[PDB]
Ligand binder design. Structure first.
Ligand SMILES: CCCCCCCC/C=C/CCCCCCCC(=O)O[C@@H](COC(=O)CCCCCCCCCCCCCCC)COP(=O)([O-])OCC[N+](C)(C)C
Ligand SMILES: CCCCCCCC/C=C/CCCCCCCC(=O)O[C@@H](COC(=O)CCCCCCCCCCCCCCC)COP(=O)([O-])OCC[N+](C)(C)C
Ligand SMILES: CCCCCCCC/C=C/CCCCCCCC(=O)O[C@@H](COC(=O)CCCCCCCCCCCCCCC)COP(=O)([O-])OCC[N+](C)(C)C
Ligand SMILES: CCCCCCCC/C=C/CCCCCCCC(=O)O[C@@H](COC(=O)CCCCCCCCCCCCCCC)COP(=O)([O-])OCC[N+](C)(C)C
Ligand SMILES: CCCCCCCC/C=C/CCCCCCCC(=O)O[C@@H](COC(=O)CCCCCCCCCCCCCCC)COP(=O)([O-])OCC[N+](C)(C)C
Ligand SMILES: CCCCCCCC/C=C\CCCCCCCC(=O)O[C@@H](COC(=O)CCCCCCCCCCCCCCC)COP(=O)([O-])OCC[N+](C)(C)C
Ligand SMILES: CCCCCCCC/C=C\CCCCCCCC(=O)O[C@@H](COC(=O)CCCCCCCCCCCCCCC)COP(=O)([O-])OCC[N+](C)(C)C
Ligand SMILES: CCCCCCCC/C=C\CCCCCCCC(=O)O[C@@H](COC(=O)CCCCCCCCCCCCCCC)COP(=O)([O-])OCC[N+](C)(C)C
Ligand SMILES: CCCCCCCC/C=C\CCCCCCCC(=O)O[C@@H](COC(=O)CCCCCCCCCCCCCCC)COP(=O)([O-])OCC[N+](C)(C)C
Ligand SMILES: CCCCCCCC/C=C\CCCCCCCC(=O)O[C@@H](COC(=O)CCCCCCCCCCCCCCC)COP(=O)([O-])OCC[N+](C)(C)C
Ligand SMILES: CCCCCCCC/C=C\CCCCCCCC(=O)O[C@@H](COC(=O)CCCCCCCCCCCCCCC)COP(=O)([O-])OCC[N+](C)(C)C
Ligand SMILES: CCCCCCCC/C=C\CCCCCCCC(=O)O[C@@H](COC(=O)CCCCCCCCCCCCCCC)COP(=O)([O-])OCC[N+](C)(C)C
Ligand code: NA
Ligand code: NA
Lengths: 531, 180, 531
């Protein structure tokens, strides 16, 4: 429970540096692993994780005075790159304690900064931020993989002004001319990390992770993706859009001109059949593609059963579109006419999945984001209550009918017409009590047509005033995933033409070598930083 | 419809016509795009299922457009093999287009109206400005003497000492804190 | 232009009291009337009205130092009750310069206060606020009749704490017990002024006058009207509501059971005819009442031709209802069957004019206020543009028709059905160019049904977020007019049972007599005025 604890750990938490220096000098080890249940990840349990190391506690506890003392104390100094059972160094652990509150975020960045210089002063050659925990994550990847907007916003924009501690800084100013100054961000382990690039950790993450849609608004990420978009992804996406439009044009005609006389599989007799079956072949191939391309997705992005509809609503429909295509082949060689049933759901999904390609366009893609939110939020709530009413009042109605609408389908079908403006208040005379039939339909109409549909309009308006920004940021994330799924798939061998940035020598290795870094230029202006 | 041009001589009507032309270009074009994708998506589906007369992409698209103007028959064909498909598909069309998307547009418009309200007053004044300028050019176009806003008002002196005559526009104003 | 000006007037405006004392002592009159064009009411002209008297200028110019000097200067003192050609004293003129800005309102109240005490110190017996100008208005009535919310809010709540200057104060505290304190407002010339009570000047005013709907929120007015409402007006209004409901029940049945065989005037043959003509008599009498009761209104409230729809939308409909009734009598004895046309508009107006009586109920009356605003604002704008479209596309359509809808009525009638959800896209086949007919109707539908109706919903929502408070305050003013039209009409001889307040001796005449004042009690609590 407390397994691994020391009285040194006590003193750091009880605000007692007078006794930390007392315990270390008498030989209290400063590598001790508090590998006890209370000291692990909370996960609901009443705990505090800090890093399973004394130095880690002081960093997560805001005594920078203590922290420095642990590292130049003459009796014994903590190993700066010492990690825990999870593999988390102090900087790793210093991320996992972040919670994206300003009082926390101001501190963690203030502290995270200071262990770096200290480790640089102690060890100009050791690289701390490159260290990886047990899982395979860095402090940068951990911040992005865990939702830590302020830490990430710090690490990327890390401009340090010190003689020996600029090789750690990441946001470099190359030149300046009056109010104009031209910054430089680093892109090391952001676009092409061998393991867990920041982009590939923000985008291939789960909606449980907070602030997925806010992290890409951190500079340079936004500018970086719009650079990949403008350079090579936009052309490929428009091309992917064209092929899918030609696909659906072809699957549409091969469907429209389906044989009607016989049972499948049908015969190549005239020339139009040959030029149609072609389209039918090409129709299936896309389904196989979207099938494999969906299996791929739902393996390498092991989907949380709830996250399917939030993060992956479109992928679900392309996959579902594929399934109806494959069922359409199983049933076309199984001689069953029911291939058409499947085939028509593929078309309808197929054409609606054009809205996928809205994400190459801001105002249309934001609109399609609002659509998928309204579906999952406002419409599902609506249709639930609507069907309770529909089924409630239908049963009532069809129980009153005597004799033909003496069926729960037709009555439910007639009562659904009221909500699409096609309700007859006289669709039956076959009953005994007109007062009942009318009171009941009016109650249905008032509750459903006058109230509930118009309430939905009102609910939607509330939603639109709320998800307006959320939907812009879900849009940019949709486009980000396209940029990443693209640059993988398209290149997948060379990975040299999408190199955002360039070799820009920014400074020097603290030993003295040159500091070459792939860096992203950003041009900026100020009118109050006059110095 | 180009009568709505002449709304710009009237503030509350001209602002309304500005909102109209914004909704057309912003909210309606986005809508009708997505609407036609759905309309054409579900029509093809429907007319592919039809066997026999609505066995035409016009008439099916024409019948499915009626749902959105409140004139949809869920029984406009019996000429098919699979009623479950025909109904699931039209209901999906109706739910997506009539229940969701039209009512979403109302909701989008309301968001727009809360935003372009000031923008539209200022686009209105600019519309009227262009009328004032296109007018005073065209009407006079020879004399250009009756529209002289302001008057010769001697305001001061040339720094050499001559008089400073300037066409000037008078504005009357009040203050209750500039007591000096 | 400057007719009547003096060099004394110069010095007050040029910030020069050193020379005001110079001019008066040499004999410069301090009664001089600046009865010149620049010194009269602006009314668009570039002027400054101040009161046509020197003392009046200094009060409207913010030199209280000067003002006091004018009245104890030994050479000659301004007459405090000296008025101008308009009849406005300094206090009158001090109202007309108010503009309901805080910097102005803070001052005018600060100054208005001080001439009163000064006039009280000079003249404990003269009554300044009772003085009336040429028109017949007091400084209190002028503030209400002219829209001066802060002045009025000052005068009514005027609590002064001085030994000799409480007989001027109006808001008296009678008792106090800890945090509880029980105030007392005066009601002199507020509910029963012989001339221009504040209520009868706020309510019988024109919408041009700003802040009609805000003035009644000034205490004690709001509490005072809710006291008349709860005491005697609510019962009478519900009674007036009952009689009108019995009226319309009777005019409804006499209309429903109208003779159908013959020409009017019809014959009393059976008994139901006698018991019907009765209702027809009683029907007309209400019309005469609402006719005279409307003539009355539109004489003693000489209506601005634009103000008809804003302040008097309902009165217009009751009057119009009356006219259709009287035309129904002119045409029933003129033997013409067209009495029915008139009669049915009376009914439809008659029943819709139930919404009048919503103003006895807050949430319904506010709703009826929103209705009449939407009609005049949102619907009229809509229907204008709608009819341009309707008529634009109809002419287009009927010009294309060849042959029967070859009529501008029927086409306009068919195209109006699209907007009520009853449009047929196939109402004609009688034409030559189907592409044109369809493109044109779709353009009509898209512009009118999809855009413009739904835009109206959106416009209404904007309006509702705006007029929500405005409509509550227009409601209270509607009810106020009912309270005033009631207490006049009902009593109209005795005027003794509606006496809001009671004789409460508050203090003393500065000579020494008792100070009896009709006063309105208000109970209040504080938790920071601990003294
Ligand atoms: C458009 C963009 C997409 C791509 C181009 C596609 C070009 C489009 C054209 C392509 C081929 C046209 C055939 C010409 C010769 C036969 C004419 C004939 O009898 O037609 C008839 C049927 O015709 C068919 O059924 C043809 C099949 C059309 C499927 C769409 C093409 C598939 C793609 C692979 C093809 C190569 C393309 C590959 C390169 C991309 C016309 O109809 P009908 O006479 O009334 O017959 C009964 C109708 N009923 C069944 C409804 C009751
Ligand atoms: C290409 C193949 C099909 C033909 C094209 C059809 C679609 C049109 C072309 C699409 C791709 C090529 C266009 C590039 C040029 C700019 C377009 C433009 O006007 O953008 C403007 C409007 O926005 C749109 O026009 C976008 C609407 C289409 C999005 C796809 C939705 C579903 C397609 C179903 C189609 C039916 C398919 C079946 C029949 C073929 C601006 O967009 P934005 O919102 O401000 O975003 C930022 C713009 N930016 C990214 C450029 C900076
Ligand atoms: C003249 C020829 C046609 C007859 C007149 C018809 C139109 C009416 C007259 C138009 C011109 C003359 C009117 C001047 C007097 C004021 C009008 C008024 O009530 O304004 C008010 C209402 O606003 C309106 O009445 C404006 C509505 C009409 C605008 C034109 C739109 C399309 C016309 C299609 C017509 C069908 C044509 C086919 C059949 C003929 C106030 O307006 P406002 O919004 O508060 O703006 C500020 C007002 N201000 C500028 C005055 C300060
Ligand atoms: C409800 C609250 C309001 C006040 C009370 C009112 C009580 C209501 C009743 C009142 C009188 C009923 C008459 C009874 C005797 C005749 C019966 C008869 O033949 O009826 C017939 C017609 O009947 C009429 O036309 C009657 C006229 C009704 C007008 C309403 C009453 C007017 C108020 C003054 C009266 C005294 C009240 C004064 C005190 C307030 C019935 O219809 P029918 O047989 O089918 O005839 C043809 C129908 N068609 C013409 C449609 C084709
Ligand atoms: C009387 C004669 C007719 C029968 C009555 C019918 C109407 C009802 C009775 C009306 C008068 C007597 C009711 C007093 C008791 C309270 C009512 C109540 O529930 O108020 C509540 C609801 O509000 C309403 O019920 C008001 C709705 C009716 C307003 C009139 C509109 C048109 C009438 C057309 C009628 C058809 C006529 C044709 C057939 C007859 C509360 O109201 P509120 O909005 O919160 O306001 C504050 C309440 N306060 C002022 C009490 C503090
Ligand atoms: C003479 C014969 C040929 C006639 C003309 C052929 C052209 C026929 C036309 C259309 C159908 C084309 C083939 C099927 C593809 C389906 C569409 C598709 O997946 O588009 C992808 C575009 O991205 C691509 O990579 C598309 C393929 C590129 C090659 C161009 C088509 C020719 C290949 C076929 C060989 C032809 C030879 C014969 C084949 C029998 C979709 O984009 P995505 O990025 O996957 O994103 C959506 C899905 N996701 C969001 C879930 C990820
Ligand atoms: C979305 C639309 C509305 C709901 C649809 C789902 C409900 C499923 C509906 C029907 C039952 C499922 C099918 C079972 C097998 C067939 C039996 C059958 O259909 O009905 C039987 C009767 O049955 C009733 O009248 C009561 C059945 C409904 C109650 C069960 C709860 C449904 C819960 C979910 C409800 C939503 C709860 C609210 C939302 C949370 C037999 O009737 P018939 O065959 O028509 O008889 C015709 C006789 N003839 C041959 C002479 C002409
Ligand atoms: C929030 C919870 C949801 C709401 C739950 C409650 C909802 C309940 C709603 C409505 C209930 C009230 C309407 C009537 C219902 C039928 C009863 C009946 O038998 O009527 C008879 C009418 O008898 C008459 O005398 C006519 C008067 C009724 C007018 C019709 C209603 C208009 C529709 C809107 C009304 C909205 C009012 C509702 C406002 C709440 C019908 O039989 P009949 O044979 O035709 O009789 C006369 C025929 N004759 C004249 C030719 C001789
Ligand atoms: C706005 C309304 C919806 C869209 C309209 C635009 C689409 C253009 C529509 C039709 C094609 C254009 C006309 C070409 C020449 C005539 C062929 C034809 O009409 O259809 C052929 C079939 O064809 C099909 O069934 C598939 C055709 C549509 C797929 C092409 C993509 C459209 C892209 C844009 C779509 C929007 C994408 C979504 C928005 C971004 C022939 O059919 P038919 O002649 O009826 O056969 C009757 C047989 N009879 C004689 C026995 C009775
Ligand atoms: C977000 C994405 C968009 C939405 C996509 C999905 C949308 C899909 C929507 C709806 C799908 C569900 C409705 C049924 C569909 C047809 C299937 C079928 O064969 O039914 C049969 C009914 O069989 C029955 O037993 C009656 C029960 C169904 C009630 C009718 C639905 C009411 C309309 C509103 C429901 C809304 C529920 C939907 C809520 C989501 C019809 O055949 P039949 O021969 O008439 O059979 C019985 C006849 N008999 C009783 C006389 C014997
Ligand atoms: C057996 C015979 C009698 C049968 C029963 C009689 C009862 C018949 C029933 C209804 C009709 C009653 C007579 C007509 C009045 C019309 C309604 C009206 O104006 O109401 C007013 C109520 O305030 C009143 O003062 C109404 C009259 C009170 C007396 C009660 C009715 C008897 C008088 C008649 C003599 C009966 C003897 C015979 C007469 C031929 C309206 O209120 P308001 O404040 O004016 O506000 C609205 C208008 N404004 C906003 C524009 C201002
Ligand atoms: C609100 C509803 C829409 C507008 C209504 C107001 C417009 C007034 C409408 C008609 C004219 C007024 C009546 C005059 C006398 C009769 C002539 C007539 O009716 O039409 C003539 C034709 O005329 C046309 O086709 C053009 C007439 C309309 C243009 C005039 C401008 C209207 C301006 C305001 C417009 C709103 C502007 C937009 C809003 C600002 C004769 O046609 P007919 O007799 O049918 O011929 C049938 C032949 N048959 C016997 C063989 C069958
Ligand atoms: Na409808
Ligand atoms: Na309808």
């Amino acid at each position: 429970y407390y397994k691994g604890q020391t009285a040194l750990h006590i003193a750091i938490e009880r605000r007692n540096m007078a006794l930390v220096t007392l315990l270390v000098e008498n030989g209290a080890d400063v590598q001790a692993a508090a590998h006890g249940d209370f000291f692990k990840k909370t996960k609901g349990r009443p705990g505090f994780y800090f890093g399973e190391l004394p130095l880690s506690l002081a960093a997560c506890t805001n005594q920078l005075g203590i922290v420095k003392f642990l590292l130049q104390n003459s009796w014994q100094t903590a190993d700066i790159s010492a990690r825990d059972s999870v593999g988390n160094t102090v900087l790793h652990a210093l991320v996992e304690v972040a919670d994206n509150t300003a009082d926390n975020t101001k501190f963690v960045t203030s502290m995270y900064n200071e262990i770096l210089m200290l480790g640089a002063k102690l060890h100009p050659t050791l690289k701390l931020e490159e260290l990886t925990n047990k899982k395979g994550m860095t402090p940068l990847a951990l911040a992005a993989g865990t939702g830590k907007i302020g830490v990430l916003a710090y690490i990327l924009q890390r401009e340090i002004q010190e003689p020996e501690c600029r090789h750690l800084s990441r946001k470099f100013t190359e030149w300046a001319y009056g109010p104009v100054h031209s910054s430089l961000y680093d892109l090391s382990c952001i676009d092409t990390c061998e393991k867990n690039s920041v982009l590939e950790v923000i985008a291939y993450s789960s909606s449980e992770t907070p602030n997925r849609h806010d992290m890409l608004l951190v500079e340079p990420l936004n500018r970086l993706l719009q650079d990949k978009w403008d350079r090579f992804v936009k052309r490929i996406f428009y091309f992917n859009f064209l092929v899918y439009c030609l696909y659906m044009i072809i699957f549409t005609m091969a469907a429209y001109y389906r044989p009607v006389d016989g049972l499948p599989p049908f015969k190549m007799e005239k020339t139009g059949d040959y030029f149609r079956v072609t389209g039918e072949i090409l129709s299936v191939l896309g389904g196989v593609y979207f099938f494999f391309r969906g299996i791929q997705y739902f393996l390498q992005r092991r989907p949380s059963m709830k996250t399917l509809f939030v993060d992956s609503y479109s992928e679900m429909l392309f996959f579902l579109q594929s399934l109806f295509m494959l069922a359409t082949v199983v049933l076309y060689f199984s001689h069953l006419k029911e291939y058409v049933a499947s085939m028509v759901f593929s078309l309808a999904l197929g054409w609606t999945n054009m809205l996928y390609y809205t994400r190459g366009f801001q105002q249309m893609g934001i609109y399609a984001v609002m659509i998928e939110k309204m579906i999952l939020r406002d419409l599902c709530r609506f249709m639930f209550v609507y069907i309770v009413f529909l089924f409630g009042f239908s049963t009532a109605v069809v129980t009153l009918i005597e004799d033909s609408y003496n069926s729960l389908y037709s009555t439910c079908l007639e009562l659904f017409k009221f909500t699409i403006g096609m309700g007859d208040l006289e669709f039956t005379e076959n009953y005994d009590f007109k007062a009942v039939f009318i009171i009941l339909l009016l109650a249905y109409v008032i509750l459903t047509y006058i109230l509930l549909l118009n309430m939905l309009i009102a609910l939607m308006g509330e939603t639109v005033n709320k998800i307006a920004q959320e939907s812009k940021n879900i849009w940019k994330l949709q486009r980000a995933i396209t940029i990443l799924d693209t640059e993988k798939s398209f290149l997948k061998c060379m990975r040299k033409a999408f190199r955002s940035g360039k070799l820009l020598q920014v400074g020097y290795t603290p030993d003295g070598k040159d500091d070459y870094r792939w860096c992203f230029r950003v041009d900026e202006v100020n009118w109050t930083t006059w110095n």
